[PDB]
Design a protein around this ligand. Structure first.
Ligand SMILES: [Zn+2]
Length: 183
């Protein structure tokens, strides 16, 4: 099972989020992102110092409590992300879709890019292609997205993660879960 241990590492790597009708909303209290199917999910990459050129950013989904993949229905597109992949990157011409030869787990990698002239963090846009409730897919089991900062050889430089619930009413479900957390 892929490690989900938070690791800021030498560059002080950690994630930040943005609220995007609600299509995407993040709960700091639950460290959980609630999002609609296939909509833009802005995830920010924050570092204290800039990693070396050739640095890469990998996103992978795992069950919080077995490979995470789309249910048969949602496998059926940009012609880049394999139909079985739950996580897709939006607006990046250099996304690589990978399947581990040993664990069969899917992941999508993009080159790490320093913040834009004026901005303090790097934003990557992700899309989740199947619902948390999908039978034959996640079937209501909670999942986690693990983001790893890596060197050109795949060595770990940093790691952060967040739970994700892909659902039809992100704002409503976030409120329900936070209220219940409070309860
Ligand atoms: Zn599905």
């Amino acid at each position: 099972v892929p490690s989900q241990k938070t690791y800021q590492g030498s560059y002080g790597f950690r994630l930040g989020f943005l609220h995007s009708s609600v299509t995407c909303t993040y709960s700091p209290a639950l460290n959980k992102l609630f999002c609609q199917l296939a909509k833009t999910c802005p995830v920010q990459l924050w570092v204290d110092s800039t990693p070396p050129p050739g640095t890469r950013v990998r996103a992978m989904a795992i069950y919080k409590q077995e490979v995470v993949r789309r249910c048969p229905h949602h496998e059926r597109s940009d012609g880049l992300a394999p139909p079985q992949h739950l996580i897709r990157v939006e607006g990046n011409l250099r996304a690589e879709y990978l399947d581990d030869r040993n664990t069969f787990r899917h992941s999508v990698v993009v080159p790490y890019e320093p913040p834009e002239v004026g901005s303090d963090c790097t934003t990557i846009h992700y899309n989740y292609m199947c619902y948390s409730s999908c039978m034959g897919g996640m079937n209501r089991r909670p999942i986690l997205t693990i983001i790893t900062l890596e060197d050109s050889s795949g060595n770990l430089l940093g790691r952060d993660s967040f739970e994700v619930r892909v659902c039809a009413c992100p704002g409503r479900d976030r409120r329900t879960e936070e209220e219940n957390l409070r309860k």
